[PDB]
Design a protein around this nucleic acid. Structure first.
Ligand code: AMP
Ligand code: NA
Length: 645
DNA sequence: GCTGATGCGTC
DNA sequence: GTCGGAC
DNA sequence: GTCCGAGACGCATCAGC
């Protein structure tokens, strides 16, 4: 028999044979170490196609030898507990995880934290960790499904003292870990596998696997490499087609619990016959590509006619109306928010004609003040309860701004152009002021008329404009292009928006790709009244890899053991390295918000809360400025007031 | 019962 | 959400 | 262009008090 120890499993080898090169036998549980070894081979390469090939080899062995374990192996590869709509949450972050490592090793929680921060990866701490659990019985090797079952067991633990119950399961896993298993179990619980391979690549590997090694064969499978009879060119074309069948199906039914059973019983080629878009099953939403100016929009949309629509500052709400009356609402991430919007459920009868029997609407939920009849800031929207039983208790009303229709009366509109989908939206749905409204739109290509429209959108309390083609490449097929729309935000424009010069007062050690250097920084404004620096926000994006290495080499010389007395951070995350205030960086953000932690400009707008920056990004260093010339807290307050108008 | 840390989702 | 890097 | 992996702040949960 095949007694290959999993420690030697190599899914990246040339001429991989699904049966003979697997490190487990027919009918045996897929060892979790087989998955870990696959992760190792995947993270040491940078080409996606090489990663897909490697994962595909594992999946072919699983199909050939252990079909029941295909589903848990996929979820482990994605670092997911299940379909997004089932609302499964581990309830385990770095806090719970690091606490579990400390007890499993006898170390102080502070020591494990420091080491994890230094290495930038909890997985490397759990692997180099000396285990204190002097167990008197060697545990069996972990299995892929067994580890997946324990992860779901962790999720289901709720109530008081549940944390200690979660830790016990985690500790039990680590005591049974061998080789690199502990590394990836810790990474999975942290939520940071660091593979460089995610949803799109897992689908590509899956489609390739079931195409090369069709499931459902009599063992041993007579057909283990269905590409052998094809030329390289025909093989590539054939695999791309099968990949699209899986991608487009998944985009309409992103639920492996529904796809994999069909896949194993009927094959990939017949998958669309048994799995298709349906109300009650969320689908992947169309996303937008950032554009930096109106000129870029015409370039990307040369020739093709397009429309512009207000980009409202709310939350995406995918509204499903099933044949029968059942209504469900999903988020951008396929999460079920039905219980959050009882006021929207009771509103559906008002927005549709008597002929509408089912639909899937793409809308933006926006906080709405019925007294003043005006859009309220996104911040007000986030104060709604996540499970509102009685609509009579809701305090923040919402108005739905519909901008697309994906399904109508039992028929999918995914292959229709926007012009038709938009037309079906207007002909079949009814507007109500402040409750359900079509997105304010404009059809033109006159640059002058677009800039005016962009301005009016900002005056009407919007982030900017969405630009979408009407007929050329204007379908809702996410597998063909997920970012088929263009977003033009006010703060994308060169020289427009909020730009601040802030003092660097602290550095945070980086994680993953940022390990061994600073991944983020603590910034502050200058309060000229008390002559103190007040933390305003953290910063962790906007610089190249080369700029960030220079920030590391430069700021390392400013590291202090204790903070200066004139530096107030109050409730902000204490930096790993206090920095002598000196460096002044130019920062851009989308908005300013009243913060519950940051002290910047406290007392200049509200007595208790300071001000922070929404989505800050690094622009450039200001070598011509010292901390005393940084943006003042007074200027921060003035900036915040210019918003509230 | 209350507070604050933690987890996770929204942008 | 933003951003940059490797392909 | 694709794909992937490197902020503020709100509710909800829960450990510690
Ligand atoms: O920045 P981003 O990529 O999340 O932007 C896309 C999001 O913008 C919201 N939005 C608001 N108004 C619209 C219209 N008219 N069309 C499309 N999207 C819109 C959505 O929430 C979307 O996810
Ligand atoms: Na590169």
């Amino acid at each position: 028999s095949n007694d290959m120890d999993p420690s030697g499993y190599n899914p990246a080898k040339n001429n991989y044979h699904p049966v003979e090169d697997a490190c487990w036998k027919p009918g045996q549980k897929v060892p979790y170490l087989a998955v870990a070894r696959t992760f190792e081979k995947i993270e040491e390469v940078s080409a996606r196609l090489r990663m897909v090939e490697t994962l595909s080899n594992l999946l072919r062995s699983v199909v050939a030898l252990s079909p029941p374990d295909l589903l848990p192996v996929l979820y482990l590869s994605l670092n997911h507990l299940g379909p997004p709509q089932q609302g499964l949450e581990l309830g385990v972050g770095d806090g719970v995880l690091l606490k579990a490592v400390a007890q499993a090793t006898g170390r102080q929680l502070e020591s494990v934290r420091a080491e994890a921060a230094e290495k930038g990866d909890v997985g490397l701490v759990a692997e180099n960790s000396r285990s204190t659990q002097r167990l008197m019985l060697p545990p069996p090797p972990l299995t892929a499904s067994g580890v997946f079952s324990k992860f779901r067991d962790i999720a289901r633990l709720t109530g008081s003292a549940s944390t200690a119950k979660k830790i016990d399961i985690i500790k039990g896993l680590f005591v049974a870990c061998r080789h690199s298993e502990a590394r990836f179990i810790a990474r999975s619980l942290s939520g940071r596998l660091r593979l460089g391979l995610a949803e799109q690549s897992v689908l590509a590997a899956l489609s390739q696997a079931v195409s090369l090694t069709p499931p459902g064969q009599e063992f041993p499978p007579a057909m283990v490499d269905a590409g052998k009879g094809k030329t390289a060119e025909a093989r590539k074309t054939w695999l791309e087609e099968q990949g699209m069948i899986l991608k487009q199906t998944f985009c309409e039914v992103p639920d492996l619990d529904r796809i994999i059973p069909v896949l194993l019983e009927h094959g990939l080629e017949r998958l669309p016959e048994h799995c298709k878009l349906s109300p009650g099953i969320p689908l992947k939403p169309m996303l937008a590509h950032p554009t930096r100016g109106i000129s870029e929009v015409l370039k990307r949309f040369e020739e093709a006619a397009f429309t512009c629509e207000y980009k409202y500052d709310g939350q995406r709400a995918q509204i499903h109306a099933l044949e029968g009356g059942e209504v469900k609402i999903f988020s951008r991430n396929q999460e079920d928010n039905t219980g959050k919007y009882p006021d929207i459920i009771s509103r559906i009868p008002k927005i549709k004609l008597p002929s509408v029997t089912s639909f899937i609407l793409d809308t933006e939920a926006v906080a709405w003040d019925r007294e003043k009849k005006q859009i309220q800031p996104f911040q007000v929207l986030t104060t709604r309860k996540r499970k509102e039983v009685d609509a009579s208790e809701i305090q923040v009303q919402v108005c739905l701004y519909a901008f697309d229709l994906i399904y109508l009366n039992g028929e999918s509109l995914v292959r229709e152009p926007l012009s038709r989908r938009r037309q079906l939206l207007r002909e079949n749905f009814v507007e109500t002021e402040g409750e359900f409204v079509f997105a304010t739109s404009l059809d033109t290509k006159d640059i002058e008329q677009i800039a005016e429209f962009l301005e009016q959108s900002v005056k009407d309390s919007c982030e900017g404009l969405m630009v979408k083609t009407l007929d050329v490449d204007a379908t809702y097929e996410i597998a063909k292009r997920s970012h088929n729309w263009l977003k033009l935000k006010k703060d994308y424009l060169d020289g427009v928006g909020d730009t601040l010069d802030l003092v660097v007062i602290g550095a945070y050690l980086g994680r993953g790709k940022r390990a061994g250097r600073y991944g983020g920084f603590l910034l502050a404004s200058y309060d000229e009244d008390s002559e103190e620096l007040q933390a305003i926000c953290k910063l962790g994006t906007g610089f190249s890899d080369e700029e960030l290495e220079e920030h590391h080499q430069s700021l390392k010389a400013l590291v202090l053991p204790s903070p200066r007395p004139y530096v107030r951070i109050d409730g902000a995350v204490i930096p790993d390295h206090w920095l002598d205030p000196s460096a002044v960086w130019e920062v851009k953000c989308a908005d300013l918000s009243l913060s519950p932690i940051y002290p910047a400009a406290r007392g200049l707008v509200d007595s208790d809360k300071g001000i922070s920056l929404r989505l800050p990004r690094f622009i450039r260093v200001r070598e011509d400025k010292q901390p005393e010339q940084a943006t003042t807290s007074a200027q921060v307050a003035c900036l915040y007031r210019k918003q509230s108008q």
